[PDB]
Design a protein around this ligand. Structure first.
Ligand SMILES: CCCCCCCCCCCCCCCCCC(=O)OC[C@H](COP(=O)([O-])OCC[N+](C)(C)C)OC(=O)CCCCCCCCCCCCCCCCC
Ligand SMILES: C[C@@H]1CC[C@@]2(OC1)O[C@H]1C[C@H]3[C@@H]4CC=C5C[C@@H](OCCC(CO)CO)CC[C@]5(C)[C@H]4CC[C@]3(C)[C@H]1[C@@H]2C
Ligand SMILES: C[C@@H]1CC[C@@]2(OC1)O[C@H]1C[C@H]3[C@@H]4CC=C5C[C@@H](OCCC(CO)CO)CC[C@]5(C)[C@H]4CC[C@]3(C)[C@H]1[C@@H]2C
Ligand SMILES: COc1cc([C@H]2Oc3c(O)cc([C@H]4Oc5cc(O)cc(O)c5C(=O)[C@@H]4O)cc3[C@@H]2CO)ccc1O
Ligand SMILES: COc1cc([C@H]2Oc3c(O)cc([C@H]4Oc5cc(O)cc(O)c5C(=O)[C@@H]4O)cc3[C@@H]2CO)ccc1O
Lengths: 380, 380
């Protein structure tokens, strides 16, 4: 492949996808507040989980139709969802219009964004994925502040209109996904399940799906933990700045260095990104000083980066460019449920003991189990 | 060409363009009213005239870029114009955002919609143009009532958002323009002016440009004339129904029958539309009865249909499928000024004498002169 040229354009488009999806999701809570201030928590998770739960279908549509058509359709559906959100005034139409439309369109627009990078970059696929991931991370962490500032000025409908504008620009950028590689019986044709005929992929996906609960618990619950335990410190934005900076840096660096790792050995990066996190999840209760929290945030971002930034290229390397959309889609589908179920269970455990210690101690285990499971994949 | 199949799909898309552009323009006045009701004319004409005045540049793109790219870009610009209209709250930013953006995007999206029809239909080009024109007419005369109903319910920003999603669907449909036939020095390359090397095209375009003032005066000024002179009749919607029905019927019929006329003889149809209308324009200040007004409306619609519905295929026939975008664009550009200037001059004439008699008498002449000019084009 070119490993450059028009590929870089695609990278930009890919970035505009990720940061504009997750970022918008990061704003959901703010939007909820808006609603309350105009009328004086599960739909937000449903819409976000629809990105990964519906990915297996997007994989089929990507193998059959293509990256461009699927991405454009998903972007159009997301635009329509945000549009009808701007128009709807209800608590039942909001659920349908946001979740079923916007999240599904996000899934359809998000699945092909990695397969296209795989189309254009082979030797420098890791670096392109790292660029996309770092840009997406920065944009996602920056979006909610802009949404809050808009809320201070305009109402909810206008905000939904701006989000639909973001989705519109996304769909326009999605047309740069120019194909570069070739492309009851119908039920068995669409669900052949050929990637699950390889032990390496099976065990890799199983480990990644097993790690997700405890992988995602700390990131959601750190802010609440610091707010509860540490009430006498006012510089809480330092934590966010540290996490974001180190996470973007780690994403870029991991994407770069994953290219120099010959074969399946890059899987080892992921284990470390699960090992330390695991261990880190069991030392958050032990932090008595601000500096300890800062160090934990640095390590949290470092662990966050590698996982995603190589999970994409490792998915492309395990099975090949042909069976890459399917592998990515089913990895995402398997991760869909545990990631959503984790933080809820962490909160439930917190409510049953009055402290986050047990929640973090239990969330530190699944990542370690996943790391141990993944450690044995490169050995065969 | 196919003269069918996917071409019909294009026809639908083409329809969605025309009816959705002109219809939206027909709503401008209503929008203005809403603005006043929230704060208690030239901009509307400028935005509409940008469709035809800017067509020569759209012709240059359509021949170097293509119908699909130009149509999508124009639709995107129109969407952005309606968006920023929904957001802006001012009397100077409104002018820019509506006129310069929406009208120019409408020009860019509207010019290729005829060239693509010519691409797909050659032997049945007239019928496709007639279908597009009839659907466009019905949609245009149906839009303002729906806009009024929406205004009675929601505010101006939401109405602009609805128009924006109309433009969005238009842009989505404009991707079905798949090409079917091939595609200081740069200044002379873009402005070669080769269609003007043909005397037939020169005289045809000159006659069509000369007729426009008086061609378009009666349609705008008939409602005002009946409101002023006929104040004792309350069934004024019968006039609109007659005009719309007969105009759509005439568009379809003229488009269908122009295919049976071998060569340049179809130009004669246009001269009839210029002759009768002329005479009709001179007989409006002679109707003492409601039935006479109904007959005049029927004849007005009949004259309206043929002109447009054959102006497209005759433009394609005079110069060929290669120099068709250029011919259409420059015919539109030449028509741009007189069509805008006409009704204003008719109103100015009405003011200075206290009645519409002289205005209609003067507006009846330019169409007759254009008919006489065009009569001699098929003779050589
Ligand atoms: C309830 C839900 C309802 C859902 C409704 C359905 C939604 C989805 C429907 C559409 C999805 C279907 C697939 C879409 C089509 C994708 C494929 C396709 O058509 O081809 C793509 C086409 C080309 O694809 P192609 O495949 O034909 O390319 C040709 C390749 N060969 C020859 C091999 C076949 O892409 C384009 O070329 C279009 C380019 C348009 C450029 C647009 C530029 C816009 C610039 C805007 C600037 C605005 C800012 C300016 C502001 C100024 C302010 C001052
Ligand atoms: C490895 C990385 C860990 C971080 C991360 O995963 C990746 O986890 C996600 C959770 C997100 C936060 C959720 C809620 C809020 C509160 C909101 O509060 C308004 C202001 C406030 C004070 O003024 C009240 O007014 C501001 C935004 C913020 C902090 C989000 C930022 C982005 C975050 C950190 C996301 C990011 C992708
Ligand atoms: C055949 C030719 C094609 C072009 C053309 O005909 C000639 O197409 C016609 C459509 C007309 C509009 C239709 C409807 C309305 C609503 C009305 O609302 C008053 C109140 C009422 C509810 O609307 C209830 O009493 C105001 C006028 C307006 C905007 C017309 C303006 C003139 C227009 C644009 C005409 C235009 C010259
Ligand atoms: C609300 O309940 C939950 C919330 C979350 C949030 O926590 C994270 C997180 O830690 C990491 C991501 C990254 O995910 C990716 C996956 C990919 O495959 C590719 C990528 O480019 C990305 C990134 O860009 C994303 O930043 C996303 C999120 C969720 C909010 O964005 C997780 C689990 C939950 O249950
Ligand atoms: C406000 O000042 C003016 C207003 C008007 C309005 O009167 C007409 C009219 O009589 C006919 C059209 C048709 O024009 C076309 C031209 C084409 O090349 C192809 C087509 O498909 C169409 C049609 O669909 C249109 O219906 C448009 C309009 C204007 C409002 O729509 C004219 C001159 C003015 O100065």
């Amino acid at each position: 492949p070119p490993e450059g040229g028009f590929g870089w354009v695609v990278v930009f488009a890919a970035t505009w996808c990720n940061g504009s999806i997750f970022g918008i999701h990061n704003s959901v809570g703010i939007l909820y507040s808006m609603l309350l201030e105009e009328e004086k928590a599960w739909v937000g998770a449903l819409a976000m989980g629809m990105i990964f739960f519906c990915s297996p279908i997007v994989s089929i549509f990507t193998d059959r139709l293509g990256c461009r058509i699927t991405a454009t359709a998903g972007a159009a559906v997301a635009f329509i969802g945000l549009h009808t959100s701007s128009f709807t005034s209800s608590l039942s139409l909001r659920y349908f219009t946001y979740g079923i439309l916007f999240g599904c369109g996000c899934s359809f627009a998000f699945q092909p964004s990695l397969v296209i990078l795989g189309h254009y970059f082979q030797r420098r696929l890791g670096l392109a994925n790292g660029v996309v991931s770092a840009g997406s991370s920065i944009f996602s962490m920056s979006f909610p502040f802009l949404i809050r500032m808009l809320g201070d000025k305009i109402k909810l409908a206008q905000t939904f209109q701006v989000l639909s504008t973001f989705m519109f620009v996304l769909m326009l950028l999605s047309l740069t996904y120019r194909p570069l590689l070739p492309s009851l019986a119908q039920l068995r044709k669409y669900f052949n399940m050929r990637v699950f005929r390889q032990r390496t992929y099976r065990i890799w996906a199983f480990g990644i799906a097993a790690a997700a609960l405890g992988y995602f618990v700390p990131y959601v619950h750190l802010m609440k933990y610091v707010e509860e335990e540490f009430s006498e410190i006012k510089e809480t934005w330092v934590l966010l700045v540290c996490i974001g900076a180190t996470s973007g840096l780690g994403r870029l660096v991991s994407g770069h260095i994953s290219d120099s790792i010959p074969g399946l050995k890059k899987i080892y990066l992921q284990v470390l990104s699960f090992l330390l996190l695991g261990l880190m999840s069991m030392m958050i209760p032990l932090c008595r000083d601000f500096g300890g929290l800062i160090v934990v945030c640095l390590f949290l971002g470092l662990c966050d980066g590698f996982f995603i930034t190589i999970m994409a290229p490792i998915a492309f390397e395990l099975v090949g460019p042909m069976q890459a959309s399917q592998a990515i889609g089913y990895l995402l589908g398997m991760m869909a449920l545990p990631m959503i179920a984790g933080p809820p269970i962490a909160g439930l455990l917190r409510n049953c003991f009055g402290d986050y210690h047990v929640a973090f101690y239990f969330a530190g285990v699944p990542p370690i189990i996943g790391a141990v499971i993944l450690f044995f994949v490169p050995l065969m």
